[PDB]
Amino acid sequence: TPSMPAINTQTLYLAGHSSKLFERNVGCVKTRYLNQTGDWVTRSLIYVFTFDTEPWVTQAGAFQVKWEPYSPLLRVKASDYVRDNLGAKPDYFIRTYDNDFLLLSDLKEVRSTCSLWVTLKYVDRIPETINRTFYTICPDPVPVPFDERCYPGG
Ligand SMILES: *[C@@H]1O[C@H](CO[C@@H]2O[C@@H](C)[C@@H](O)[C@@H](O)[C@@H]2O)[C@@H](O[C@@H]2O[C@H](CO)[C@@H](O[C@H]3O[C@H](CO)[C@@H](O)[C@H](O)[C@@H]3O)[C@H](O)[C@H]2NC(C)=O)[C@H](O)[C@H]1NC(C)=O
Ligand SMILES: CC(C)CCC[C@@H](C)[C@H]1CC[C@H]2[C@@H]3CC=C4C[C@@H](O)CC[C@]4(C)[C@H]3CC[C@]12C
Ligand SMILES: *[C@@H]1O[C@H](CO)[C@@H](O)[C@H](O)[C@H]1NC(C)=O
């Protein structure tokens, strides 16, 4: 079966989210794998804050994730900074996933907010099936448009 992306070693990019989650001046949102200790994977949360900040500066946070096989929950132990400023929760509902995408939902909201994550394979072109699922399940879906500037080099 496909490998669960959250505990895998490929970088994940935020491709879509519910409007309510929206943070003004936050762009290029992605997560890189750092290491693993026991059942916990450590990843970074990378982004750019575009207001009154130099254009080459990347903001960075860190968090840990745990996924028991076939669990519908992703466990998240986010840093104090990430919990305080980016609203990270201790658990997320896993709607679906494949080798190169992950769709997460909030646990405690009745009108559950969502986030769609993809690997490099789909950053310039989200497959129609994933896009359709995202627009079906997610309240107030906001796509994150492709931007060349959010990547190393160009
Ligand atoms: C990802 O999906 C988006 C959502 O698609 C819409 O919802 C799905 C669940 C399904 O019902 C699908 O058929 C719907 O289109 C896509 O966005 C939609 O794209 C439409 C076409 O570009 C757009 O439409 C408008 O334009 C036509 C032009 O003739 C008008 O007739 C029509 O009335 C609309 O004004 C539609 O508005 C738009 N929806 C939203 C909410 O953005 C999106 O393109 C797709 N992306 C990929 C990569 O496949
Ligand atoms: C990808 C996996 C492995 C876990 C990620 C967990 C945490 C860090 C994720 C899950 C949902 C994410 C949020 C989803 C949507 C937005 C809106 C955007 O405007 C700014 C980033 C922000 C606010 C994200 C910040 C990081 C976030 C809180
Ligand atoms: C994993 O990364 C974190 C974050 O930088 C670090 O604190 C930790 O020492 C690293 N090593 C291991 C094996 O946990």
Author numbering: 1 to 154
What's the publication's text?
We obtained two crystal structures of recombinantly expressed R. appendiculatus Japanin: (i) a tetragonal form with one copy per asymmetric unit (data to 2.2 Å) and (ii) an orthorhombic one with two molecules per asymmetric unit (data to 2.4 Å), both in complex with cholesterol. In the tetragonal crystals, the same dimer is formed by the asymmetric unit and a symmetry-related molecule across a twofold axis. The main sites of conformational mobility are the hairpin loop 48–58, the loop 105–112 and the C-terminus, residues 145–152. In the Japanin crystals, the cholesterol ligand is completely sequestered inside the protein, except for the –OH group at position 3, which points towards a solvent accessible cavity.
To provide insight into Japanin’s mechanism of action, we here present two crystal structures of the protein. As was predicted from the sequence, the protein folds as a lipocalin, with an 8-stranded anti-parallel barrel at its centre.
